[PDB]
């Protein structure tokens, strides 16, 4: 509550008046496999601002410049999602948290 971030804006918002509890634990030792973990991503770029408790299921192409992409990508039209590329045998610091 009260924090900011690209995750907190385009991935998952949380109310300031949130009275609750959250549980997390390490679970990346078998839910992943070598070759980069593209299974779990995080949203970076989105044209419409998200509201609290709204789901992000759209995968629209990022629209980088003022000149509209409008279905055609290229210069100033770049893809909005990228993978993690983490290695499976790293510590929890390089690992996701299951919440």
């Amino acid at each position, epitope marked *: 509550p009260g924090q900011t971030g690209k995750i907190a804006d385009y991935n998952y918002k949380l109310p300031d008046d949130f009275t609750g509890c959250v549980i997390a634990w390490n679970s990346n030792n078998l839910d992943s496999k070598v070759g980069g973990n593209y299974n779990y991503l995080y949203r970076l*770029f989105r044209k419409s601002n998200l509201k609290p408790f709204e789901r992000d299921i759209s995968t629209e192409i990022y629209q980088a410049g003022s*000149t509209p992409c409008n279905g055609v990508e290229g210069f100033n039209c770049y893809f909005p999602l990228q993978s993690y590329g983490f290695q499976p045998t790293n510590g929890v610091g390089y690992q996701p948290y299951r919440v």
Partner: antibody
Amino acid sequence: EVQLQQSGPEMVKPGASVKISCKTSGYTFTEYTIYWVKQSHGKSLEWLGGINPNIGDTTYNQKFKGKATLTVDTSSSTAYMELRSLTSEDSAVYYCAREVYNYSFAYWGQGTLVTVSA
Amino acid sequence: DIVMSQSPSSLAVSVGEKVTMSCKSSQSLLYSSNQKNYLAWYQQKLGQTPKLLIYWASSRESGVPDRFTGSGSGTDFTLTISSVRAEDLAVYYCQQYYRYPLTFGVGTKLELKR
């Protein structure tokens, strides 16, 4: 209030080096990017392009395409656009402009009205 | 689209009247989704690099001078200067940022009645 200011008198000799810089100010650099323009010293204005530095790939118009090695920096608050084989006829000022999520060339600086000999 | 470079040269414009900086767009207002237009105006006077004047062809920011008078839409664009004065006698240019390739046109170099 994003402000980018030019710098440096230009008397460019061909086959030489060039120092590319744009002092970005008024904003943390991870929010807004830089788009560049050349003025044809008294001809029609010439659009070239810019960069959104998230992956870095850019294509300009023909004259500014691939003469030199294209770089960018997302951290030290400098965008990069250069030329090789600079001649007198294209001896022009390196203009750069801040961007807005609505409009691309938003704010200029004082500018440099530079006349260049070879 | 085609990169705009006006020809033939002459299309008469007057100082102090409903001034017309004439450059047309090859596209209509048919913006496929949600109908947004992308129009600009950069006009070069002595030394000064032009700033933002017009965006999206209908709205300017608060503090933008009211010299711009809205007129024309679709495949045409024309801007009128309100009360052309000595500040308003300079070289004129127009620009749009809708599609590939992006370019700045030749503009209009002003001449006065005599």
